[PDB]
Amino acid sequence: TWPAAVPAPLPDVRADSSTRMLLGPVVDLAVNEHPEGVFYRIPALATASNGDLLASYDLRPGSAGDAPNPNSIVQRRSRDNGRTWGPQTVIHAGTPGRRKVGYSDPSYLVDPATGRILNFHVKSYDRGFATSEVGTDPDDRHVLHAEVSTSTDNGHTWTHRDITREITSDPTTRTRFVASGQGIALLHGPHAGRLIAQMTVRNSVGQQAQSIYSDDHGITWHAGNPVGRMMDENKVVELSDGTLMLNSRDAARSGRRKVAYSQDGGLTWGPVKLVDDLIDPTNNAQIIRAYPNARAGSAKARILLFTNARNATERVNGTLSVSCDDGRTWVSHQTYMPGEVGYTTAAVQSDGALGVLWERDGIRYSTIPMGWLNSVCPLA
Numbered sequence: 001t002w003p004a005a006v007p008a009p010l011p012d013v014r015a016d017s018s019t020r021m022l023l024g025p026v027v028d029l030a031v032n033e034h035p036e037g038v039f040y041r042i043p044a045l046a047t048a049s050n051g052d053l054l055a056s057y058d059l060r061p062g063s064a065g066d067a068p069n070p071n072s073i074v075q076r077r078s079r080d081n082g083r084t085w086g087p088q089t090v091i092h093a094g095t096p097g098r099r100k101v102g103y104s105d106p107s108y109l110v111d112p113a114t115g116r117i118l119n120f121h122v123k124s125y126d127r128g129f130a131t132s133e134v135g136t137d138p139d140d141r142h143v144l145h146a147e148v149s150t151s152t153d154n155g156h157t158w159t160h161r162d163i164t165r166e167i168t169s170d171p172t173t174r175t176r177f178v179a180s181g182q183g184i185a186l187l188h189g190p191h192a193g194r195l196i197a198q199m200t201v202r203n204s205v206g207q208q209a210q211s212i213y214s215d216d217h218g219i220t221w222h223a224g225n226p227v228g229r230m231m232d233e234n235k236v237v238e239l240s241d242g243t244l245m246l247n248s249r250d251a252a253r254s255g256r257r258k259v260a261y262s263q264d265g266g267l268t269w270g271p272v273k274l275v276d277d278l279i280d281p282t283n284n285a286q287i288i289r290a291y292p293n294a295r296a297g298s299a300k301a302r303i304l305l306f307t308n309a310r311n312a313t314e315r316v317n318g319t320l321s322v323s324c325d326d327g328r329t330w331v332s333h334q335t336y337m338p339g340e341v342g343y344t345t346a347a348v349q350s351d352g353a354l355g356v357l358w359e360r361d362g363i364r365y366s367t368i369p370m371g372w373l374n375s376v377c378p379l380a
């Protein structure tokens with residue numbers, strides 16, 4: 001039986017001997033048709049409190065179908081910053097058939113204050129995101145449910161529970177999913193300690209972005225006020241002063257990401273605008289702090305990293321973009337993976353390099369050493 005996780009700070013980026021951004025070796029974490037008729041999609045990557053690197057993704061049986069295909073959440077672990085990977089383990093396995101159950105679209109949320117790791121994902125019965133109906137009864141086969149899996153042992157074992165009712169304060173909310181990739185723990189400002197992740201919802205107003213957050217270190221979850229129209233998978237990041245930012249996929253296909261700001265820890269958001277700098281084909285993406293422990297007023301606290309498919313209509317050219325100024329401008333875009341990438345995510349690793357995952361005939365992993373960062377955002 002594995003030991004209890006202990007509290008430990010999230011990693012910050014560290015300087016390498018590199019002077020240019022160069023992808024390391026590519027690792028095939030899961031390959032479609034290995035085994036026959038099984039497909040892999042929807043990546044999540046995190047550094048656990050013990051420094052292990054954890055990758056999660058869907059196992060999709062039969063085809064790469066979204067919910068309500070009876071998918072499973074699975075995981076692989078590296079204890080050497082991505083050089084080698086243990087065998088796949090199951091976070092929560094779906095069930096085929098007339099009473100099918102599916103677990104799909106994982107995101108991790110690591111709480112450095114406790115060491116606990118959360119993995120959010122849908123729980124489906126007969127309906128997916130688009131066809132789910134109003135209702136929150138846990139056995140309702142017409143509802144797309146929200147589950148969170150908790151691990152207290154750095155991701156070796158999991159316990160599961162349905163959070164749909166507690167995050168549904170508006171009874172017209174007919175569907176929801178937490179965006180795959182990773183949520184955050186807040187470290188700065190009045191809401192330090194809060195754990196927060198973003199969802200997409202449909203309700204009487206439209207298709208909105210909505211934060212869910214916990215102030216008791218993941219025992220109970222509450223939804224903030226929803227925001228925006230034609231929103232979709234969106235990710236939240238804590239800026240240098242503790243203002244939050246959400247960066248969203250645009251369901252209206254503008255060819256750009258969308259952005260909004262919260263001054264109250266995700267309870268309310270302001271107006272949603274396009275980010276003209278961030279070309280995107282209506283696809284998932286991940287934004288993170290490079291130095292999440294750095295304090296307000298430091299240059300390091302203002303540096304954000306963003307991964308997506310930098311293209312207006314096709315999910316190609318996995319690209320790392322850097323902002324030095326709390327997301328106000330994006331001064332550097334560099335494609336680390338030409339061609340098909342689908343969903344990407346990135347996470348700071350324990351060694352201070354960046355891990356990336358993308359989708360091409362399954363899930364692929366690589367590393368970007370980060371010594372070149374100071375040449376784009378001076379660090380002093």
Ligand SMILES: CC(=O)N[C@H]1[C@H]([C@H](O)[C@H](O)CO)OC(C(=O)O)=C[C@@H]1O
Binds near residue numbers: 130283
């Ligand atoms: C829960 C769920 O359906 N997630 C799916 C998501 C969603 O349907 C869309 O973001 C809504 O607009 O889309 C995609 C996609 O490749 O585009 C795959 C995700 O599995």
